[PDB]
Design an enzyme around this catalytic site. Structure first.
Site, PDB file in Angstrom:
ATOM      1  N   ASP A  45       6.012  -4.917  -0.462  1.00  0.00           N
ATOM      2  CA  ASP A  45       4.603  -4.583  -0.639  1.00  0.00           C
ATOM      3  C   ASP A  45       4.238  -4.480  -2.114  1.00  0.00           C
ATOM      4  O   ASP A  45       3.085  -4.733  -2.487  1.00  0.00           O
ATOM      5  CB  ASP A  45       4.273  -3.280   0.088  1.00  0.00           C
ATOM      6  CG  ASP A  45       4.263  -3.438   1.593  1.00  0.00           C
ATOM      7  OD1 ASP A  45       3.937  -4.545   2.071  1.00  0.00           O
ATOM      8  OD2 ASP A  45       4.579  -2.454   2.297  1.00  0.00           O
ATOM      9  N   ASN A 158      -1.134   8.161  -0.072  1.00  0.00           N
ATOM     10  CA  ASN A 158      -1.962   9.083   0.700  1.00  0.00           C
ATOM     11  C   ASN A 158      -1.144   9.824   1.750  1.00  0.00           C
ATOM     12  O   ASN A 158      -1.357  11.020   1.984  1.00  0.00           O
ATOM     13  CB  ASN A 158      -3.108   8.311   1.354  1.00  0.00           C
ATOM     14  CG  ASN A 158      -3.790   9.094   2.457  1.00  0.00           C
ATOM     15  OD1 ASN A 158      -4.747   9.826   2.211  1.00  0.00           O
ATOM     16  ND2 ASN A 158      -3.304   8.939   3.683  1.00  0.00           N
TER      17      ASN A 158
HETATM   18  C1  LIG Z   1       3.185  -0.921  -2.335  1.00  0.00           C
HETATM   19  C2  LIG Z   1       3.040  -0.331  -0.979  1.00  0.00           C
HETATM   20  N1  LIG Z   1       1.917  -0.307  -0.300  1.00  0.00           N
HETATM   21  C3  LIG Z   1       2.234   0.349   0.879  1.00  0.00           C
HETATM   22  C4  LIG Z   1       1.462   0.702   2.002  1.00  0.00           C
HETATM   23  N2  LIG Z   1       0.169   0.398   2.142  1.00  0.00           N
HETATM   24  N3  LIG Z   1       2.079   1.378   2.996  1.00  0.00           N
HETATM   25  C5  LIG Z   1       3.377   1.669   2.867  1.00  0.00           C
HETATM   26  N4  LIG Z   1       4.204   1.379   1.858  1.00  0.00           N
HETATM   27  C6  LIG Z   1       3.561   0.715   0.892  1.00  0.00           C
HETATM   28  N5  LIG Z   1       4.084   0.265  -0.310  1.00  0.00           N
HETATM   29  C7  LIG Z   1       5.474   0.374  -0.765  1.00  0.00           C
HETATM   30  C8  LIG Z   1       5.846   1.823  -0.941  1.00  0.00           C
HETATM   31 CL1  LIG Z   1       7.408   2.178  -0.139  1.00  0.00          CL
END
Ligand SMILES: Cc1nc2c(N)ncnc2n1CCCl
Ligand SMILES: Cc1nc2c(N)ncnc2n1CCCl
Ligand SMILES: Cc1nc2c(N)ncnc2n1CCCl
Ligand SMILES: Cc1nc2c(N)ncnc2n1CCCl
Lengths: 258, 258, 258, 258
Positions: A45, A158
């Site tokens: 992500d 969040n």
């Molecule tokens: C960069 C990122 N965005 C999200 C998201 N929306 N939900 C969960 N994990 C995310 N990550 C990586 C962090 Cl572990």
């Protein structure tokens, strides 16, 4: 139809990228990282976050696709073994749109687009801001910072702060507190706040006017800040969907079991 | 235009009720507690809750008005000293609608309409249910209970459980946990969940099938339960607005200061 | 040296019980469930809870041992395959003591001993009590209930409510809130409270005097209640230790991984 | 008997300081800010924090007294109008001792004494450390940071993070999490942890070895860190008590009402 591919940079992602490019060559696909209409992200992500910000000026002409070479991500929801199956269908699907968060900073303007969240901290000193909602003074926040999250970003920072997870079909934004002080004289709401479209949340300083403002993974310092403005953006990110992968199933696989 | 007035029953509310009825008599208003088009509540949000459930079969022909004889309520947002000013304008305003939560119980059906929330507990034994979201098994909850709240109800029981406050213009529902067990073998999401319209959250038993189900202030026991179904109702409650009293200002006055 | 064994009642526990009894017969051990000096529990922490309350009148002459036929428990920290190894050493170890919580109820007295926690709810109506700490009015609690936990019980119900985990070598008790109401007029501390030895926490009614009081797994209704008194008991439960199994390792195995 | 007085620096504190010095001159008191035996703080808990760290090398020969010129503090529990009454009694009381937290940092040692807490963050990058408790790997923490608090410091930063308030007669320390990540692959305990005396909590890096370590109000960056060691200090701070002001009353006045 033009396309491009970003890689995490490791051995598994670079090799998976070259094999997909070779597969697209067997079709009528044209590689173009300048004006693409299909942007594929291979990694995590975080890599998808980078791919989104590299083309936030052409969001309406781009459908994003994510591939996770590590663990299951929320934006990278394709297995590496399903890459060749993806190359065929992508060369002739439906589009899915998610809302985004707009962040405006003013001095004595700079706008940013966030996919996950935008947070505000204090550059060293104690963080004190007044929270104004639609020109109404709501609270004087006193603590570590504040976090305004998109619907799809509620599963990221969040969530760690206690915020609620909300389905991306809801055009809204959610604000959460970071280690607020609450005694007999300092009072904040504590609960997270979910704001609908066309609602404006403004953050105004009290003493210190230097703030460490972040947008997704980008964190940059801002000096002599007059106001930080939040609202749901009118622009939306577009994903290319090929199968049914509900948001609540993505939440289950990422947090419950898989 | 027909109308009726409910009272908390104390000395201040009954006297304020008789003075408003006498004021409406000076106009062309007709008192009718059977088929009213204006329902006034004098007391607290609990009294307003009772007034809502007494006429949930005629929600589309009724505009509600609340008067708080005690402290500032979320549904009773009129001061007792502003009662005479209210009688004049109410006799010739705009209508404001809030979404509601539908609750379906099935045995071996009963539907309910909630203005605040609907909670599920276990009648004595330990509470174990499987949480199904749109025919997808999401989690096996293990704890005290669960709470599904309306947007305007998020400031009530939902807030005490850690849920987020959401603006009533959002057609959604929010589920929150009550003292869940989370160890290496029992896992729940923990975070609150905000569901949009047309999403169905189902609760199914595991062992015990007797549940203490509540809707707003009504709490009744249900035996041999097969499924508890949640979804945003298609019906909406209508308020009669005479001035600008934003939801975020009501939250400020009730929780920050007043 | 006298001993006895309690079983969960299922096939695995009853068979494991008869094999240990046969093993103790090969030694000079005498089975006596009336005046034992060694009490073995085979099943889970719930079975161990039952074994503790069956002999709370002879706590100073009894060393407890727990065997978990299911998953790893906090009080049952012996694998079923290690049963024969346990029979030999138990027939000729050191003793380990944990503090306990005392609960006093008064009407118009009844004392109880808790190993995990003691909670107070309201029999149907809303729960309102004044919290008095060492004859000082601390807060008027308004919500679902309150939970006073022992050190070793902080990993149970106390954990689900947000309480802190504390090492059993600390002679203290911890109080936590259940879904408290906090607005501009009703205020509780919110944070959990850890009280040392010789501190008395008293709960006094406001309107309703009927409370659903629980001690560990026993839940019984009390009518016309005048005061609920909490203090760390002077009596301690004694465990028979044969190896090093730190409390923080038990927490790791139960909640992190195993 | 030697003494000294520190001031917040504003008009009210400096004037109150000069009036107390003139009052002590009427007695046999000797002003000495080098080797004092009585240290008076006039201002807030932050001013008291500064006064404590200016003399942490002579804690066993110093009894501290706090005066709050603003609102009621936890360490400054004397009203400005009670200053003259304080000067008389202080010139001929009993001593009250609170435990402290020791912090050891090692590179490729530096010890610090904290009155409130000691926190660890990451200098820019993501914060990843392994948490070792008594040479046992407990968890790999992933988030914003960690906070180890003293008993009297649990009402400060520890409270804002969800930690429990504990009475200062308990020789213990409490660790709390800052915005931890918890998904199907990253797992922390979440609950706060209360450690007794002689228990050692060690923090060890994974990738980044640069940490922003804070002790009370002092925040300094440390590069090439090998281990961060926590334990309850053997040294104690001494307060001079003249009246009964229970800790639970100080908590009530600061957080409930006053
Ligand atoms: C960069 C990122 N965005 C999200 C998201 N929306 N939900 C969960 N994990 C995310 N990550 C990586 C962090 Cl572990
Ligand atoms: C009965 C009721 N409803 C609400 C609500 N929506 N928000 C806040 N308080 C409410 N109350 C009274 C409980 Cl104090
Ligand atoms: C009955 C019981 N006591 C405890 C305890 N102290 N910690 C964790 N789990 C416990 N259980 C079983 C509940 Cl799963
Ligand atoms: C500096 C400081 N220490 C404390 C403490 N122990 N409890 C509460 N407030 C404290 N403060 C001031 C922060 Cl408002």
């Amino acid at each position: 139809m033009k396309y491009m591919i970003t890689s995490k940079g490791d051995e598994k992602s670079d090799l998976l990228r070259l094999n997909m490019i070779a597969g697209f060559g067997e079709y009528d696909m044209e590689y173009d990282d300048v004006e693409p209409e299909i942007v594929i992200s291979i990694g995590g992500d975080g890599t998808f976050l980078s791919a989104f910000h590299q083309y936030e000026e052409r969001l309406d002409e781009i459908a994003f696709i994510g591939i996770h070479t590590g663990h299951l991500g929320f934006y990278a929801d394709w297995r590496p073994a399903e890459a060749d199956k993806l190359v065929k269908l992508l060369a002739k699907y439906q589009k899915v749109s998610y809302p985004l968060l707009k962040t405006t900073v003013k001095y004595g303007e700079a706008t940013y687009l966030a996919l996950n969240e935008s947070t505000v901290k204090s550059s060293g000193g104690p963080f004190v801001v007044d929270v104004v909602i639609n020109d109404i003074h709501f609270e004087r926040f006193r603590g570590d910072g504040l976090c305004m999250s998109t619907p799809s970003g509620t599963t990221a920072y969040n969530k760690s702060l206690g915020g609620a997870l909300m389905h991306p079909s809801i055009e809204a934004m959610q604000l959460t507190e970071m280690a607020s002080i609450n005694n007999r004289v300092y009072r904040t709401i504590g609960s997270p706040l979910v704001f609908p479209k066309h609602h404006v949340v403004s953050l105004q300083p009290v003493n210190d006017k230097d703030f460490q403002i972040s947008v997704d993974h980008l964190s940059i310092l801002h000096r002599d800040v007059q106001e930080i403005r939040y609202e749901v953006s009118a622009k939306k990110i577009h994903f290319a969907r090929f199968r049914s992968f509900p948001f609540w199933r993505r939440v289950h696989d990422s947090f419950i079991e898989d």
